[PDB]
Amino acid sequence: RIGEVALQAAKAVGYVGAGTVEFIFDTSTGEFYFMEMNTRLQVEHPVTEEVCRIKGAPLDLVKLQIKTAMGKPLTFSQEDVTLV
Amino acid sequence: RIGEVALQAAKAVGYVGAGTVEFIFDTSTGEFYFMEMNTRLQVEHPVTEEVCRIKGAPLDLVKLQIKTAMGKPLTFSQEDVTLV
């Protein structure tokens, strides 16, 4: 679900490339509320990489951003990506 | 290459669903020239199916057409499909 909310916001403003949506969460309430988003690659990009593989292959975040600039379209759905 | 030519024509007119582009070819010339296209599912659909697999799974042409009508987007690039 975190994804469905995040994709709605990025589509609404229109977005190309890589980015990060930030939330704020309370355990007692159990719900997440939007706080801020950054339209820029974070410093924490290589961290999230260790917990995601696409089509069984290692993921490179910067690679795609160059390929995104290339104009080529993607090759994978949200599905091909799995955490490990 | 047959693909690159076919995709150009379908994009130019705009197209949704399944279709077939027909060519005419001379061995002596070695080049293919456009003759006609049909904007309709052929009768020969199950034939081409035996020579194409997507993500290693059996392909169902009619299935996708319902899923295309569903509004869901695809899950595979031109690559995932291989002949066998």
Place of tokens 């939007």: A34
Any A CB within 8 A of B4 CB: no
**Token code pair at residue B8:** 């150009």
Helix (H, G, I), strand (E, B) or coil at B36: strand
Instruction: Compute the distance between CA of residue B71 and CA of residue A76 in angstroms, rounded to an integer.
Output: 18
User: Rounded to whole angstroms, what are the CA distances from A79 to A46, A59, A60, A75, B5?
Assistant: 20, 14, 17, 11, 30
Exposure of B59 in the CB half-sphere (CA atoms within 13 A): 21
Instruction: Say whether A77 and B77 touch across the interface (CB within 8 A).
Output: no
C-beta atoms surrounding A45 within 10 Å: 14
Exposure b/e, B11-47, CB count within 10 A at least 16 = b: eeeeeeeeeebeeeeeeeeeeeeeeebeeeeeeeeee
Give resolution, Å, one decimal: 3.9
Task: Count interface pairs A-B at CB distance under 8 A.
Answer: 10
Instruction: Say whether B74 and A79 touch across the interface (CB within 8 A).
Output: no
Q: Pick from B67, A20, A70, B84: which is nearest to B76 by CA?
A: B67
State the nearest Cα–Cα gap between A81 and chain B, in angstroms. 12
Instruction: Give the residue ranges of DSSP H helices in A21-60.
Output: 45-49
Closest CA in chain B for residue A72: B77
